[PDB]
Ligand binder design. Sequence first.
Ligand SMILES: Nc1ncnc2c1ncn2[C@@H]1O[C@H](COP(=O)(O)OP(=O)(O)NP(=O)(O)O)[C@@H](O)[C@H]1O
Ligand SMILES: Nc1ncnc2c1ncn2[C@@H]1O[C@H](COP(=O)(O)OP(=O)(O)NP(=O)(O)O)[C@@H](O)[C@H]1O
Ligand SMILES: Nc1ncnc2c1ncn2[C@@H]1O[C@H](COP(=O)(O)OP(=O)(O)NP(=O)(O)O)[C@@H](O)[C@H]1O
Ligand SMILES: [Mg+2]
Ligand SMILES: [Mg+2]
Ligand SMILES: [Mg+2]
Ligand SMILES: [Zn+2]
Lengths: 238, 176, 194, 614, 623
Amino acid sequence: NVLLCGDPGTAKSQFLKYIEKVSSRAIFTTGQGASAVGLTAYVQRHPVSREWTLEAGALVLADRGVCLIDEFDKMNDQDRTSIHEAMEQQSISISKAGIVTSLQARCTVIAAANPIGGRYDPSLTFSENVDLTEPIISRFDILCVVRDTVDPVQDEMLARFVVGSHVRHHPSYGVEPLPQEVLKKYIIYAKERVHPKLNQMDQDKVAKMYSDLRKESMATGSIPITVRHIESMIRMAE
Amino acid sequence: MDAAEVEFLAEKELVTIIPNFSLDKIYLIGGDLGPFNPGLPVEVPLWLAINLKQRQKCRLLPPEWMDVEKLEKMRDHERKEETFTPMPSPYYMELTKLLLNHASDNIPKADEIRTLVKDMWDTRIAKLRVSADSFVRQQEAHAKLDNLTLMEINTSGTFLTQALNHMYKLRTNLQP
Amino acid sequence: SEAYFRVESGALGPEENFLSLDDILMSHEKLPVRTETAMPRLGAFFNAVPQGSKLELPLWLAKGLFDNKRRILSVELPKIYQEGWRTVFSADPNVVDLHKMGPHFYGFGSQLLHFDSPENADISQSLLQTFIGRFRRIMDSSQNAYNEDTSALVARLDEMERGLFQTGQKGLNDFQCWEKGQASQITASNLVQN
Amino acid sequence: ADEGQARKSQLQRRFKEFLRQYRVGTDRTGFTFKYRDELKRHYNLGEYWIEVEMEDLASFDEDLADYLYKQPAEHLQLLEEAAKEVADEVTRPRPSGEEVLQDIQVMLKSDASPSSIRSLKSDMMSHLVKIPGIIIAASAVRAKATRISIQCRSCRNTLTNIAMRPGLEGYALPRKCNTDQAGRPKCPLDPYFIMPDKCKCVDFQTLKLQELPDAVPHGEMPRHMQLYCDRYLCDKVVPGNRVTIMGIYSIKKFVGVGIRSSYIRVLGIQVDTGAVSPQEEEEFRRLAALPNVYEVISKSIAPSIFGGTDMKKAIACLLFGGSRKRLPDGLTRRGDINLLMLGDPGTAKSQLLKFVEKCSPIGVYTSGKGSSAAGLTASVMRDPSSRNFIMEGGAMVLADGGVVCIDEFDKMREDDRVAIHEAMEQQTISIAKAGITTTLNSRCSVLAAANSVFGRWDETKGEDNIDFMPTILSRFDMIFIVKDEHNEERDVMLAKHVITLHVSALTQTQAVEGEIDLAKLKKFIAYCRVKCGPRLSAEAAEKLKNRYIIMRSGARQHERDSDRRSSIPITVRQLEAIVRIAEALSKMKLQPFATEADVEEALRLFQVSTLDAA
Amino acid sequence: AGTVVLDDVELREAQRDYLDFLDDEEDQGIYQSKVRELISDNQYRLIVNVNDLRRKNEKRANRLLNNAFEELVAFQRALKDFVASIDATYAKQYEEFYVGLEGSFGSKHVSPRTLTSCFLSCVVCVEGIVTKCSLVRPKVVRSVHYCPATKKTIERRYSDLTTLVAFPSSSVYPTKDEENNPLETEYGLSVYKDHQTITIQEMPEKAPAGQLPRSVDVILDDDLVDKAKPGDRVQVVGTYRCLPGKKGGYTSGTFRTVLIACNVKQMSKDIAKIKKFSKTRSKDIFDQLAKSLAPSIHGHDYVKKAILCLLLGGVERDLENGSHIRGDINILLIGDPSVAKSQLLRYVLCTAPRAIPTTGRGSSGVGLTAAVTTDQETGERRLEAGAMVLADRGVVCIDEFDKMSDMDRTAIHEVMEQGRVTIAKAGIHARLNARCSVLAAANPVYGRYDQYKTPMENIGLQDSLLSRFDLLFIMLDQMDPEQDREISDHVLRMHRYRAPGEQDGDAMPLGSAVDILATDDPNLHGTKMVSAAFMKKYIHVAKIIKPVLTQESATYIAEEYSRLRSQDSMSSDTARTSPVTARTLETLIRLATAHAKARMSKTVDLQDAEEAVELVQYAYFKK
Ligand SMILES: Nc1ncnc2c1ncn2[C@@H]1O[C@H](COP(=O)(O)OP(=O)(O)NP(=O)(O)O)[C@@H](O)[C@H]1O
Ligand SMILES: Nc1ncnc2c1ncn2[C@@H]1O[C@H](COP(=O)(O)OP(=O)(O)NP(=O)(O)O)[C@@H](O)[C@H]1O
Ligand SMILES: Nc1ncnc2c1ncn2[C@@H]1O[C@H](COP(=O)(O)OP(=O)(O)NP(=O)(O)O)[C@@H](O)[C@H]1O
Ligand SMILES: [Mg+2]
Ligand SMILES: [Mg+2]
Ligand SMILES: [Mg+2]
Ligand SMILES: [Zn+2]
């Protein structure tokens, strides 16, 4: 799970739409446009026979795919708390109107958010300017901060890249990328025909890292580290 | 009395073997046996026959009653009669188990023999169940069980006798 | 052969066995009585216990105090041996729960007969007919429940009937082990657990 | 033609010889006629059914097994008739009152690997199939006619003992009067009617089999399959049971044109897992007898979780439960233990809930966010088949006799949270809605997981960390406030444990020393629950009384010193909670009485909850 | 449909046996006497005891229970012969004389769960609770038609699958003579019988673990057509039958099963010397009854006294001007968690007659009052009574009363104020009787009672609703160590108790049909606390005493009412739970009447008035 927090006009939404375009089984949703019920699962009278029936929400429909949540901080707390079970336990348990069952929601959540006031503050830590709480912050394996600080040489290079992009895409780092068709084929082959297996990972290194990362997190208060960061290490290696 | 002890008494029954060894007459306390001549029949107790078969020293012959037609006739007679019919041996079930488990190679149609003896056993156990139920229901003080075998009695007799002891005391508790 | 066997119950006979744990436990069960004479100092247990007072006390104590002319006390039957419950037993003996109503139903009922109640004949016939009614189901379940959970079969049986049930189970298991050839092996005794 | 009857006769004879001749064992040990013996014992017990193994039948005669697989409906009735014959010749003679021979239900089981519900495709119609699933619904048991007789209204011409085909298929009454001449009137259009007194009927039941949760394709809802059960398969399962069904895939035979509704006629049920074999039984006696059974159980609770030993011990007490009681005046006292885990994230609360739901003999997991008052306790709704209001059980009803694992317990609405007060304390659900007025049973433990009001406990805040009411909090026997402690050696050991845990996933799942497998501990909990109800000993009760009074005085003085009410109250329900915990500890050991040691351990566990209060 | 042929030889043998049983003259004459009373009371159903039939003829009893229909028609024909022998004039008044059955039926005692298809055609005794009744509708059994053209009368008699007859019968209503003339029905000369369907449901406490209660449909005819109403716990003896149906040339083998009842028994409320001795021997029998009321709950003496007053009830007054005063007493308990409010409510549910359980979140207004449902027999919409309607002349126990919605409490306003509920639904606008006492239990807002807030804001309910309750008790978990010691001693003693028929290690059994006779088989201080079984009968006899108010007690009540008004004046706005009003005076009259009922005095004395004033003082003036 990934959280992109940061300033306006820093291509967070463009990243989310790219992941939507490239990935199979992508669900895109935004802020107030989502609900707890709509995200997870919903119960309705069946349209013709009128018995209560359970129905798939976004997280269930993305069960082996990606759920993309733009404007993540703009959601309601009641809507945002619905995704905890799907984020960690990878299930959605519903007990409503005689239905008592758990659905599979094994998706990857990629969220985009703004800090408080719409501008990240280096005077403060992430926990001090995000407005999210520890249970949801800890559920994101990768936690990115994107800033729009002034830097003239980088601004010049970025401007040249952007204007060149507008030239290249008219209707008519160094390393070179793959074509996107080839990348899609590569992705699905890598996901379905290949399965990594961990033999060893030099446990002392990661254990000591986690121990003093916990110490510094307790010192500064910047981010809770819990136990999930260890398992995030294993997941990222795989 | 245990089923193993009933088997111990069944083991005293005489069966015919064909030795592959030569041995003069042996004067056992329970009666002399032999001489043992290779290739000829000789009649010996079942424990000795089974031991010699296990030690590969003889070929066991089926008893005269271990024949499929004879056993079918006995089974049908048992199924038709209401009382226990006379059995071909007083330890026929034990004989069947011992001989067929240790000498099925020697005894042809052993599957048919085992199934027919099982049929006779089932019929006679059903008759014994009927006898016990009738005894308790009609409050008998005596029953006649002439053709039952020891294993057949011993299967149910401890339970039945205990029940009848309790029944007797219940029907005589007003005696003083 | 030389296994342990407890002293057998004598509760169905004219008197119970002195050394029988089953008879001791059976005679501990309480019996309703009325005091026909006052008992000094006994109000500490239930000052005197007054004359004509109703009590429920153990069967052993009632048998000790009772006499045929009722000087110390007079005895009432428990309700399960009175005419109301006798009729329920007469309806169908197989559906009643003699574990609740006992667990020593027959033994306790047999020992009630020594109080010279006018309905001793009815009690005796009731006990005998209850046993006759329940015999077939005890026999069938004991002799045909093999290598399974017998608790459902044993639940509603009184201690005498449960003893008979275990006897039938022993016979069944003995024959089945013989048939499967497991009776041949020499085994460490049940004390081998420690 | 009658050559078909000749084929039927020889096939029935071959089934009869299978049931007469099949044996298991070896000549070195001994032989037992498996199906003869089972027929005899079941008939004498009054059971009138047997279960045949497809592999045994195939070993005896593979053609019969192939015929049963391809054409189960045709050949199963021959097998059942042969079973009736063998039952007769195995049980004859019978006592009085048992002279009339009974029909035998032959059930089927196999060692073959099962198919999925989504494997059932049109190529397999009328074939014998084996599939797994979960029972999610079960109808009332009702009567299906197996034999009828029909009489003509004009001439009283009677057809006797008409064989009714099994399953959801019906029967067509003859269009015109049979075997007599076309007189005057020739026929009223339905000449026949079913005679009321001559019908022979058997029990039948309808169930819904849901696809297993791990069999569902990604993004799809689980599929449903209707099941027809018959005779002794009725009430053999309940909703919530995991089953492997053996049955005939078939169409009902009385959206689209040529559409036919399908179902499985169940021929055998294997509950995946009301009985313990004597070997399991005596092993459970041994396990209760050994002196450190409490520690062994606690180490068996969630073995993949590092630490949390007191929490695991309290969970063991919750799994075993106290003893339910009814007092002389008719009032009931709760036996189940309610436990709340409350605090920091990433502390394995959800993993403990997921373990307990799988380890408890009866267990359901639900999220607090995803639940409602009706869906938790019980719901009222109208049935499209008949316009009347019916009840449908919620989580509490489905978990009656076990545990409800309510994850995300702080997330549920307050109006939904007040629904479970009666079901938590009184263990009943009183409904008075739409004219139906009743009181259902909900005898189940609540194991709840929740976070702080501020995510982490944030120790300066104190009582402001809790938004739960004193009413709901007093209904929890133990309230484990769980705080993620940052200690360096603890973190190193925990990280090495987690890394080894992830590494060891490929190690073929080998057995382990000093703990109980989950499948065994589940059965052991069930055995102890059904067998043992302890009580307090007198001296133990005195100890508990005095300690309770001391704790009450301490709680009062703490609240007075604070000049504010604590969120966790110390009440008479907490006294009874200590009593229940002591009884659960004794029930682990199958002891009829709880000792001072059990009371001391119960007080030790409860004083963690009292630490959480003060 | 419905006609079946029987073997005449066995029919005559059975009829001979049953007539021998009924001709009881040489013996005690029990059934001679019972048939005499059947004639004398203008009855035509005899209730026979199968215990007596087993004593006289055991095999005939067994065949009766296992072959119900043929044996029952044989028995009814024997009964008609015997009643003709006693009184031949009376025997011709009725077409048929019926026999119902009582006693012990052995294994045929069942519940709706265990009542399987194996019991078809057997006599079964089903114990359960009534959940539905249909409307009583007539059923034609024998119709006479007059042919005006031919000037002759034909008479036809009918049957259906429900009504197996053992005589030739039709199922078509005629409209034409054999000469094709029209026929005119003679309704007065025709015979019709009442017919009703009810549903008996399994007792909820006896259901297995994960299961909802099961149901069986029961058909009641003749005198039995209104012998049970919804909410009654009943035992129905009858014949279990299936109804083979057909639908247009085809039949699904699924047949619905019904119990055709032959006897219906209530299981509630069912000599005077013990009660007379008690009331004369005891001093303040009210105190002994109140403290004996709920033994497993320590303390709460005044609340127990108030609940005893609720159980005994006041007296209902109707005045010459049509104004009305209720007799029912309403009690509200507001209190902290774990102060036994729910257990007191559960005690009243277990011991009072017609005590209906209810909870705030489990109920709705419709379920509280009445619902529209469709009669499955007919299809027409009609009313189905809710909880407070079922609780008429009884109690409704509302736990979690603060958790209830105001829209639901709107119904409770009308029920408490006027003893009725008015409805306008289905085809019917009607005024249903709901004359029930209310025993409500609630928590204060914020869960625990707050000492630093007024009682009228600790109590979350509005004063308009609070005016309805006669008494309002505040129950606080005072943490006094003395009370803690004695309470914990009592609680641990209760938790150490075990029942007599139960072994030391036994876990609590789940229920089953352990009642195996239609009447109780085993059948005043405890084994000097009063016994519960005696106290039920005592309260039953005391409820009907109807004592009159006396002048000196009236003067005392007037003096103390005015004094309580002055105390209300002097009380601060934090020192009262409720204001004092004319309804406080009415409460005093009701409580004094209940105390008089407890004494069985037939006159309200100063003794009663004193306790009434003390109880009202205790309830009203607290903080
Ligand atoms: N580094 C960049 N390279 C290229 N385009 C960029 C870059 N940063 C921003 N943009 C452009 O800026 C525009 C806005 O992108 P967008 O993704 O909507 O910003 P954002 O991260 O979503 N800010 P917000 O929506 O307020 O949270 C797009 O047209 C992007 O292409
Ligand atoms: N002590 C532990 N041992 C092993 N795994 C652990 C431990 N603590 C946490 N984890 C892991 O951390 C992850 C989160 O566990 P989880 O059960 O959700 O804890 P939680 O307290 O319920 N989190 P939350 O729902 O935010 O409160 C899982 O992958 C666990 O395996
Ligand atoms: N004074 C008491 N004596 C005996 N048992 C008591 C007493 N007070 C409480 N209990 C016990 O405490 C438990 C809870 O009682 P309960 O009936 O729920 O009180 P309550 O106030 O209605 N609970 P609540 O619904 O949260 O207000 C029961 O097992 C009672 O027996
Ligand atoms: Mg954006
Ligand atoms: Mg969690
Ligand atoms: Mg309550
Ligand atoms: Zn015809």
